[PDB]
């Protein structure tokens, strides 16, 4: 039965994000410039897990009809787009920051500050809102006014240009940046290790970790957008078959949001040290000649 299986995926997202938010906000040992960006990412994932997935599950449970009043549909679409775009751009920004830190270590420490974190947060959220704004302006078109007998979805005829350009802007532009940054960072690591007698293993292990982290993003978010572009740009292709695949593929992108916080929080030692502390709650001498 689908309900219990989906609920045991809905719950971990909320739990994991809430733990991170509480931990960051509570203790001063974890309060500094970098952690605020992770707080923003946790907020985005929590808002994804709180509003979108329950309503999507409700629409799956019924015969794809719309139970809530009619006016609420454009708001739901707008929230979905906004939250997903915000999460993706947060991941891209984290990757770029990591590369800049590795390339020049001393400059990064001086430039890093609280004001820079605020500026970055504001920029990312402004981009997400600007991308997601146009959807409620052009409302959906329906044959009847009864909510019980219609279905909420972005039809090709009304939103073809928006789907094409939003797919290009939301996903592929970050993808190119991550792809180039990975190679640049790995190349930097190899040359740096070339010059500077026992730190080789650490650099190699870090390179492996970065590769795995990149693969996780690519695998989770690629098929849905590939299918969406194919559906838009292929007239000969059968629409029903593509829609059946798309409805399945959206859920992997949804699960990515729950998966994301663990990778970034668990490897960090300070979080585990604070958890342990809260759960709990040779010498140079002398001689006279």
């Amino acid at each position: 039965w689908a309900a219990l299986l989906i609920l045991m995926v809905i719950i971990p997202t909320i739990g994991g994000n809430t733990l991170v938010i509480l931990a960051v906000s509570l203790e001063k040992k974890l309060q500094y410039a970098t952690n605020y960006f992770l707080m923003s990412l946790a907020v985005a994932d929590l808002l994804v897990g709180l509003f979108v997935m329950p309503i999507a599950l409700l629409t799956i449970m019924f015969e794809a009809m719309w139970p809530l009043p009619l006016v609420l549909c454009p708001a739901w679409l707008f929230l979905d787009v906004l939250f997903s775009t915000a999460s993706i751009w947060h991941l891209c920004a984290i990757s770029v920051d990591r590369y800049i830190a590795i390339k020049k270590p001393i400059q990064a420490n001086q430039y890093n500050s609280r004001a820079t974190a605020f500026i970055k947060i504001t920029v990312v959220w402004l981009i997400s809102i600007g991308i997601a704004i146009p959807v409620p302006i052009k409302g959906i078109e329906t044959d009847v006014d009864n909510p019980n007998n219609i279905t909420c979805v972005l039809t090709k005829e009304r939103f073809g240009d928006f789907m094409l350009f939003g797919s290009l802007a939301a996903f592929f532009t970050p993808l190119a940046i991550m792809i180039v940054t990975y190679f640049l960072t790995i190349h930097a690591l190899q040359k740096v290790r070339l010059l500077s007698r026992q730190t080789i293993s650490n650099l190699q292990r870090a390179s492996k970790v970065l590769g795995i982290v990149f693969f996780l993003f690519l695998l989770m978010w690629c098929p849905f957008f590939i299918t969406n572009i194919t559906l838009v740009l292929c007239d000969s292709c059968n629409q029903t078959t593509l829609q059946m695949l798309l409805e399945i593929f959206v859920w992997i992108g949804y699960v990515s949001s729950g998966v994301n916080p663990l990778v970034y929080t668990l490897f960090n030692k300070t979080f585990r040290d604070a958890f342990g502390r809260y759960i709990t709650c040779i010498q140079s001498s002398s001689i006279i000649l």
Partner: antibody
């Protein structure tokens, strides 16, 4: 100038099947639904079904599920309705029509009128 | 289903008079539309959204509405307004029409 054209009168024997066509002109033809209606001589109107051209989605009336079939051709710009197993009761005028729609933004919802009815065609069954 | 009952079936009105026609519903609906048909001609939209006149309709006609009650009235009757009027709803499938009301002249 939106125009709809239909085939001429038909006389068919009892126990046969025949298709009727509706050809559109003056608009996209893939952004609006097509409805089919039947009017008996000196009687009220009845609703048969509607079809959405781009993906072929259809909705049917319960009383006419067995009798009627709906199809479309995008390149030729034609809509077809097929009737099978005809009886004496089924002899009336048939209309293909395009109806208005409702647009709902986040503030309000409103209806835009684009209704236009093509002239019907007569079908008779006799032996 | 939503069943519509239209009254009266046949009515008579001399030129220079105000008349009314009633359309009632089985269940509550949001809005109702009204069509006019002449003999030998396909029907044409006449009033939509329970109050608004379609383009080309004179100013004489008027509409009134509420939940499970709707009506169409004319300010002053004229010779060119003898036809058959239908009321339909566009709330939920399947769509339904009224029986129809026929207007005649009196002399």
């Amino acid at each position: 100038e939106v125009q709809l054209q239909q085939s001429g009168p038909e006389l068919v024997k009892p126990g046969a099947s025949v298709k009727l066509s509706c050809k559109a002109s003056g608009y996209t033809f893939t952004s609006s639904w097509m409805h089919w209606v039947k009017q008996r001589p000196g009687q009220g109107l009845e609703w048969i079904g509607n079809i959405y051209p781009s993906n072929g989605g259809t909705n049917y009336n319960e009383r006419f599920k067995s009798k009627a079939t709906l199809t479309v051709d995008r390149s030729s710009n034609t809509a077809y309705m097929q009737l099978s197993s005809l009886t004496s009761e089924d002899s009336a005028v048939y209309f293909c029509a395009r109806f208005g729609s409702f647009i709902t933004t986040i503030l309000t919802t409103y209806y835009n009128p684009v209704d236009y009815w093509g002239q019907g065609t007569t079908l008779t069954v006799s032996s | 289903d939503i069943v519509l009952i239209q009254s009266p079936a046949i009515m008579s009105a001399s030129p220079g008079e105000k008349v009314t026609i009633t359309c009632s519903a089985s269940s509550s609906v949001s809005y109702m539309h009204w069509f006019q048909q002449k003999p030998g001609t396909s029907p044409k939209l006449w009033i939509y959204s329970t109050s608004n006149l379609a383009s080309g309709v004179p100013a004489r006609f008027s509409g009134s509405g509420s939940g499970t009650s709707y009506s169409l009235t004319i300010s002053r009757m004229e010779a060119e307004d003898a036809a058959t009027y239908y009321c339909q709803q566009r709330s939920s499938y399947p769509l339904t029409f009224g029986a129809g009301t026929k207007l005649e002249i009196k002399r």
